[PDB]
């Protein structure tokens, strides 16, 4: 039939720092925070499950 996406049972990885004041540093704030978004395992594509049901005759 149709497939069903399955959420990745994480092993914990999220980690986004909050936007700091002193704009003289909001520039590197992104560099590291960005490396995080690229790492994020909770983003598609998700693994999928197809459900077979052949009973025969």
């Amino acid at each position: 039939v149709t497939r069903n996406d399955v959420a990745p049972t994480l092993m914990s990885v999220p980690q986004y720092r909050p936007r700091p004041a002193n704009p003289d540093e909001i520039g590197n704030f992104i560099d590291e925070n960005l490396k995080a978004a690229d790492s994020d395992p909770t983003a598609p594509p998700y693994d999928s499950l197809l459900v077979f049901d052949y009973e025969g005759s």
Partner: protein, 522 residues
């Protein structure tokens, strides 16, 4: 002399049938017992057998005698009598019309082996040849008594029994359930891991196969160790045994993702991918597909037993056959993300010459389900920098953009599902593969040269967070170059990205703030 003594003993039988009957009806327990013995010996002679088989009152009295009797001998006799009778269609219809099934069923509770053997065999014949026998056996409560008999050890008995179980279970929920409720899975599995009598093993697997389509037996069979037990036979010479286990294994597969100790199975499956039999390969590919879904230990193991190469070779040999390529490709997608061995697999696909065939599946005839899967796989393969160039040189980027455009136009003309897949998925999928692809400077150039920027920006206005994510994400990768950055700014991305900052999605906001920064970053 053989056609002269038939009608003789036959007629001679019609001469004693009536009396014998009355004797079974006699109150003196001993009279009856002796009488049963006589009727029994009589049923051996094909001649007499037809006389009893035609005397409804005799049958009814035999049945009655069988169920009410307490003589282990009368039991065995009356039981046998019904059996000997059960070999002719009139005997079946007779035994049937005279309420023999319920009696037979009750007998399945006997401690007398001979009786059990007779009873189950009579019933079997009835199931196979008597119209209405199945539902009758269900009503009598036979399933429970039958599963309980799986406790026996006579292979030939078990053979019959399981086949009865199979006959009654095929397409019947209440039955499948009752079998389950009575611990059928555990019994069936045990057989599978204990005996070696082909016929029995095959039959038992046919039962399991029938139960495997049930939502309630599925988990049970898995939990009963069904995956592994079934695995034990993927090498047997009996192709029929093997194919039934493969089928059963595939139906159970979605419910077996959290199962531990699957190395062997996972191992055999990989091997089987190299079969000549399409049904075998297909099932194998299907099973591997599901088994590698969100189970990292499984993924790791498959990669370590030659899975990538096997899957690649299968996809290669399968050509246009999508029954093989979709699960195979999905497997390859699963194997190329979220686990310590992913990187190896990413290079593995390439080092085994899969990139070409993979990029190719992005084109017709390939259907949506398959394309979706392939796009996803290409995205993972793109995580490995050692795949950017090769992947680029296979003309994947131009094609992804094509699918992205058309699919997206579809999600727009539906404002003023296909083969299951919904274009919005193809949008996210393709934009996503371009986002991870946009990591190579040369690729950034190509993606940009296809006049994709304006479209990406448009996607920022998408309601679906994930699309928003990849759109902003690919935009971020491009915007790391001046001209690109300004071309983007000039497209009016500044406005939408700004608001995507107040997005509940961490990744989305980050990408947004990144572009807004990349743009203005002198």
């Amino acid at each position: 002399v053989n056609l002269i003594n038939y009608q003789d003993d036959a007629e001679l039988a019609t001469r004693a049938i009536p009396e014998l009957t009355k004797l079974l009806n006699d109150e003196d327990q001993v009279v009856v017992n002796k009488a049963a013995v006589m009727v029994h010996q009589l049923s051996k002679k094909e001649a007499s057998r037809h006389a009893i088989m035609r005397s409804p009152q005799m049958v009814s009295a035999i049945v009655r005698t069988m169920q009410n009797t307490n003589d282990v001998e009368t039991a065995r006799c009356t039981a046998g009598t019904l059996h000997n009778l059960s070999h002719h269609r009139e005997g079946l219809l007779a035994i049937f019309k005279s309420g023999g099934i319920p009696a037979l069923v009750k007998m399945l509770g006997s401690p007398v082996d001979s009786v059990l053997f007779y009873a189950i065999t009579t019933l079997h014949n009835l199931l196979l040849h008597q119209e209405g026998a199945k539902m009758a056996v269900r009503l009598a409560g036979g399933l429970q008594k039958m599963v309980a008999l799986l406790n026996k050890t006579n292979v030939k008995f078990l053979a019959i029994t399981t086949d009865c179980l199979q006959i009654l279970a095929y397409g019947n929920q209440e039955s499948k359930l009752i079998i389950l409720a009575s611990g059928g899975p555990q019994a069936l599995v045990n057989i599978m891991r204990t005996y070696t009598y082909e016929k029995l093993l095959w039959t038992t697997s046919r039962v399991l196969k029938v139960l495997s389509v049930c939502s309630s037996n599925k988990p049970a069979i898995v939990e009963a160790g069904g995956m592994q037990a079934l695995g034990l036979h993927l090498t047997d010479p009996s192709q029929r045994l093997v194919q039934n286990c493969l089928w059963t294994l595939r139906n159970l597969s979605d419910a077996a993702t959290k199962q531990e100790g699957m190395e062997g199975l996972l191992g055999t499956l990989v091997q089987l991918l190299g079969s000549d039999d399409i049904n075998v390969v297909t099932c194998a590919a299907g099973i591997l597909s599901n088994l590698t879904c969100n189970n990292y230990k499984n993924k790791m193991m498959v990669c370590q037993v030659g899975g990538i190469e096997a899957l690649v070779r299968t996809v290669l040999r399968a050509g246009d056959r999508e029954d093989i390529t979709e699960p195979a490709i999905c497997a390859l997608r699963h194997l190329t993300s979220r686990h310590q061995e992913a990187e190896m697999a990413q290079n593995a696909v390439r080092l085994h010459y899969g990139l070409p065939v993979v990029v190719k599946l992005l084109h017709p005839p390939s259907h949506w389900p398959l394309i979706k899967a392939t796009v996803g796989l290409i995205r993972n393969l793109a995580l490995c920098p050692a795949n950017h160039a090769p992947l680029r040189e296979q003309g994947a980027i131009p094609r992804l953009v094509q699918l992205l455009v058309r699919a997206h136009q579809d999600t727009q003309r539906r404002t003023s599902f296909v083969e299951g897949v919904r274009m919005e998925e193809i949008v996210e999928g393709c934009t996503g593969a371009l986002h991870i692809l946009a990591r190579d400077v040369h690729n950034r150039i190509v993606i940009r040269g296809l006049n994709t920027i304006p479209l990406f920006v448009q996607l920022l206005y998408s309601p679906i967070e994930n699309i928003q994510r990849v759109a902003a994400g690919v935009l971020c990768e491009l915007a790391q170059d001046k001209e690109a950055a300004e071309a983007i700014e000039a497209e009016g991305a500044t406005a939408p990205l700004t608001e995507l900052l107040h997005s509940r999605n961490e990744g989305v906001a980050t990408y947004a703030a990144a572009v807004l920064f990349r743009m203005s970053e002198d």
